[PDB]
Amino acid sequence: AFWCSISYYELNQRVGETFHASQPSMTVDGFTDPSNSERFCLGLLSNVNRNAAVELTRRHIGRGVRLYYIGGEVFAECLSDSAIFVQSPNCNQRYGWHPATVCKIPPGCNLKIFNNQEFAALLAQSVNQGFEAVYQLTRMCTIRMSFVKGWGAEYRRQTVTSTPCWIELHLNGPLQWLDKVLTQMGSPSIRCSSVS
């Protein structure tokens, strides 16, 4: 199976094809190996409308980040020689800060970016809130990471779309459980017209 797919972005532009992770432990780096099920190499992804900044930052992605699925938990280890910022709603809500919290991971460090049981339990209590409350859990199945530059509060790059090189992760397991609950939540109350 794939446990997660990864989409790379340069600013607010989507660059390259979506990588599908088949291996429990892989890497997203700035190198160019095209046929490695354990290496999403960003170096080999072109972008005809790529600016100097972007080009400059790509050079510092180096060995990048190592993502890895131990049991029901995901970890991100910064191999690059530059930091990597992580925005994990599942990670943030564990230490409390306003879901949008970006957490810096200095070179040689590593953080637990997602926990299954936690999620599963957040999915359980959401059924009581109604459709809308469950529909929004898809954000909990996503994790965003910037390479070299940071964003949010503390840096004047307030949004991910501002950073030069970032990547979004979709957790398939969490998304599949979410889907099973969602197909049973009924429908919205608030209606929606065909002309407006």
Partner: protein, 193 residues
Amino acid sequence: ISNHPAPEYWCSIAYFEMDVQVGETFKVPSSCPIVTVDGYVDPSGGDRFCLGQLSNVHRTEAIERARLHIGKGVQLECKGEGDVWVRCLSDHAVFVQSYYLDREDAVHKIYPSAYIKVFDLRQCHRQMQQQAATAQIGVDDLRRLCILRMSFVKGWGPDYPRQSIKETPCWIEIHLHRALQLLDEVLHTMPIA
């Protein structure tokens, strides 16, 4: 033991229409030494990459036009571990951008029926270490050496109304996998930046 060399694909083709990639990247298996990129419409992949069946909302009247002429298009064949040859099966010309063709600044217009060599792996490989040495120049500068660009019908360069390939109504960018594999190796040897 656990991998390399030998790429699964020997190249990747990304079609474009001005500054926008149209359709999804075409990956050619190493088992398919020759691939044809024509303006026809057979969706099935294999050995044929039909640009005539790719949709685009931004597409104009000027491009519908040009696309009409891609015709039998060209062909890309892999000869030596990483050497690529081009054969213009189209009634119209083709404009190729190749460094190997520079050693021999481009818009090397290819003439209908022509069967030319456009890339030499070794020459590429050499040229990489060439850049890694002087550094001891980033990954985006050097990955170019593993890339080929080719416009169908219209041309650009320092002698046409269109200044860059991002102006042609329809073109493609080809990434040579082996050349990139050697480049992944070279990259590990350019000590920190």
